[PDB]
Structure 1
Amino acid sequence: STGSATTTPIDSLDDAYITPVQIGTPAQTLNLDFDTGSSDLWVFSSETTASEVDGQTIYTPSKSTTAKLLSGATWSISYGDGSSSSGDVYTDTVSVGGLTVTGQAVESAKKVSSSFTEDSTIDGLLGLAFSTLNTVSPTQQKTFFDNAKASLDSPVFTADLGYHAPGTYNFGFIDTTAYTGSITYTAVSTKQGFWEWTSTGYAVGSGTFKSTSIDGIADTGTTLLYLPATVVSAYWAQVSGAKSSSSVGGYVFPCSATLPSFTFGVGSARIVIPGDYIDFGPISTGSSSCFGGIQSSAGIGINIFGDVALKAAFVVFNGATTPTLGFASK
């Protein structure tokens, strides 16, 4: 089997991407944030505290003929941005892009933090990191990918995120029309439960490439590119008037600037992030200070290749017995 679903930016900045997911019988379609940095599929639901729901579409298990309470199971998760959610668990039928899993754990939120309530466009998350990170207790649950894997034509999924445009998540196949050149594969460590890999270095604009190992994770659920402070300083030093602002919470730059590209290494291959991708616009409405898309990972404890980096590439998440990541230009 295969599946193929379009993923759409939630706003004009590509802050996140939503993908429609069918849950239950008859189908209830919810728009989920597919997150390669976490391992829970959780949804706004009929159980979510009413004051914490503001425009989201909810899953109502009582209206699904295939829903069953997973008795005694609970979940609770905290993300890198300080947001959180928790609740109880149902099993149900879940389909993505025509690929169906029966018996998927659907984590029903009883509580969500303010950042979720305030984002009316995201109805929940679909985690695509390794199932070792799943938070369901006392019986840990599998991701949608892990449950689909054995049925797929190839044990893979691909992320093809758009810049200010829709893109695609495919399950079970490589679309050889979706990228240019060849795919460069690189080793993955699953020790922390992430799609963790080592970049071979970077370049700023037309500058020389610096060969240096950068360990980090491929995380579709993180907006920005978080890299070591040395690398980030070297980037922003090429933008007149850029500075790190403790008041704003990272590097800002004059909205009048033209940003340089940023290149990262994948083995001997190179992925180029155009400068435009690194512009996250005014820090507050009407400001002439703009927020940068490359930020320091210092204090986060891991480097994160978030959407800014991933949307410059066609990315293969190879879930074979020895997992690997692939990157191609597009």
Structure 2
Amino acid sequence: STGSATTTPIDSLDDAYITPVQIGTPAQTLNLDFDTGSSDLWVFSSETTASEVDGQTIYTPSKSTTAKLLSGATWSISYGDGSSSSGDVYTDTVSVGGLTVTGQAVESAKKVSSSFTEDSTIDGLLGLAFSTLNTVSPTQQKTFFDNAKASLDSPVFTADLGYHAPGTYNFGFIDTTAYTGSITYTAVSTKQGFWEWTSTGYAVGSGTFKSTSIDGIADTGTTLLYLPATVVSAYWAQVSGAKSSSSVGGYVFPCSATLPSFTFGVGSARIVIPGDYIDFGPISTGSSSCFGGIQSSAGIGINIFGDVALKAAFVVFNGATTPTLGFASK
């Protein structure tokens, strides 16, 4: 089997991407944030505290003939940005882009933090990291990809995120028309439950490539590119007036700037992030200070190849017995 679904930016900055997902019978379509940095499929629901719902579409298990309470199971998750959610669990039928999983754990939110409430466009998350990170207790549950895997033509999914445009998540096949040149594959460590890999270096603009190992995670659920302070300082030093602002929470730059590209290494291959992808616009409405799309990972504890990096590539998440990651230009 295969699936193919379009993913759409939630706003003009590509802060996140939503993908329609069919849950239950008859189908209830929710727009979920596909997140390769976590492993829970959770939704706003009829059980979510009413004051914490503001415009989201909810899953109502009582209206699904295929929903079953997973008795005794609860979940609770906290994300890198400080947001969180928690609740109980149903199993139900879940379909993405024509690919159907029966008996998928659908984690129903009883509580969500402010960031989720305030984002009316995201109806929940669909985790695509390794199932070892799944938070369901006392019986850990599998991700949608893990459940689908054996039925897929090939045990892979691909992320093809757009810059200020829709893109695609495919399951079970590699669309050879969606990228240019060849795909370069690189080793993955699953030790921390992430799609963790080691970049071979970087360049700033038209500068020379610096060969250096940068361990980090491919994370579709993180907006920005978070890299070591050394690398990030080297990037922003090429932008007149750029500075790190503790008051704002990272590097800012004059909105009048033309940003240089940033290149990262995948083996002997190179992925170029155009300068425009690194512009996250005014820090507040009407400001002439703009927020940078490359930020320091210092104090996160991990480097994160978030959407800024991933949207510059066609990315293969190969979930074969020995998983790997592939990157192609596009």
Which band: TM-score by shorter chain? over 0.9
Which digits, 9 at most, give the CA deviation of each residue in 1:55-92, with x for residues without a partner?
00000000000000000000000000000000000000
Corresponding residue of 1:322: 322
How far did residue 190 of structure 1 move? Answer: 0.0
Q: Distance in 2 between matches of 1:8 and 1:286?
A: 26
How far did residue 322 of structure 1 move? Answer: 0.1
- Which secondary structure state, in structure 2, belongs to the residue aligned with residue 174 of structure 1? coil
How far did residue 232 of structure 1 move? Answer: 0.0
Cα RMSD over matched residues? 0.1
Which digits, 9 at most, give the CA deviation of each residue in 1:111-131, with x for residues without a partner?
000000000000000000000
Q: Distance in 1 between matches of 2:174 and 2:67?
A: 32
Q: Distance in 2 between matches of 1:299 and 1:266?
A: 25
How far did residue 267 of structure 1 move? Answer: 0.1
- Which secondary structure state, in structure 1, belongs to the residue aligned with residue 149 of structure 2? helix
Gaps of 5+ in 1: none
Q: Distance in 2 between matches of 1:314 and 1:32?
A: 20
How far did residue 207 of structure 1 move? Answer: 0.1
Q: Distance in 1 between matches of 2:294 and 2:40?
A: 27
- Which secondary structure state, in structure 1, belongs to the residue aligned with residue 233 of structure 2? helix
How far did residue 167 of structure 1 move? Answer: 0.0
Q: Distance in 1 between matches of 2:206 and 2:262?
A: 9
How far did residue 137 of structure 1 move? Answer: 0.0
How far did residue 214 of structure 1 move? Answer: 0.0
Question: TM-score, normalized by length of structure 2?
Answer: 1.00
How far did residue 247 of structure 1 move? Answer: 0.1
Q: Distance in 2 between matches of 1:93 and 1:64?
A: 9
- Which secondary structure state, in structure 2, belongs to the residue aligned with residue 148 of structure 1? helix
- Which secondary structure state, in structure 2, belongs to the residue aligned with residue 211 of structure 1? strand
Question: TM-score, normalized by length of structure 1?
Answer: 1.00
Gaps of 5+ in 2: none
Q: Distance in 1 between matches of 2:279 and 2:102?
A: 41
How far did residue 174 of structure 1 move? Answer: 0.2
Which digits, 9 at most, give the CA deviation of each residue in 1:232-277, with x for residues without a partner?
0000000000000000000000000000000000000000000000
Q: Distance in 1 between matches of 2:258 and 2:166?
A: 25
Which digits, 9 at most, give the CA deviation of each residue in 1:37-68, with x for residues without a partner?
00000000000000000000000000000000
Corresponding residue of 1:280: 280
Q: Distance in 2 between matches of 1:67 and 1:196?
A: 34
Which digits, 9 at most, give the CA deviation of each residue in 1:167-193, with x for residues without a partner?
000000000000000000000000000
How far did residue 213 of structure 1 move? Answer: 0.0
Q: Distance in 1 between matches of 2:11 and 2:110?
A: 26
**1:115 corresponds to 2:115:** yes
Q: Distance in 2 between matches of 1:217 and 1:169?
A: 18
How far did residue 18 of structure 1 move? Answer: 0.0
Corresponding residue of 1:21: 21
Corresponding residue of 2:133: 133
Corresponding residue of 1:234: 234
Alignment size in residue pairs: 330
Q: Distance in 1 between matches of 2:67 and 2:247?
A: 47
How far did residue 283 of structure 1 move? Answer: 0.0
Which digits, 9 at most, give the CA deviation of each residue in 1:10-54, with x for residues without a partner?
000000000000000000000000000000000000000000000
Q: Distance in 2 between matches of 1:114 and 1:162?
A: 27
Corresponding residue of 1:174: 174
How far did residue 282 of structure 1 move? Answer: 0.0
How far did residue 152 of structure 1 move? Answer: 0.1
How far did residue 139 of structure 1 move? Answer: 0.0
Residue identity (%): 100
Poorly superposed stretches of 4+, deviation over 6 Å = none
Q: Distance in 1 between matches of 2:97 and 2:54?
A: 27
Which digits, 9 at most, give the CA deviation of each residue in 1:113-170, with x for residues without a partner?
0000000000000000000000000000000000000000000000000000000000
Which digits, 9 at most, give the CA deviation of each residue in 1:202-243, with x for residues without a partner?
000000000000000000000000000000000000000000
How far did residue 9 of structure 1 move? Answer: 0.0
- Which secondary structure state, in structure 1, belongs to the residue aligned with residue 180 of structure 2? coil
- Which secondary structure state, in structure 2, belongs to the residue aligned with residue 277 of structure 1? helix
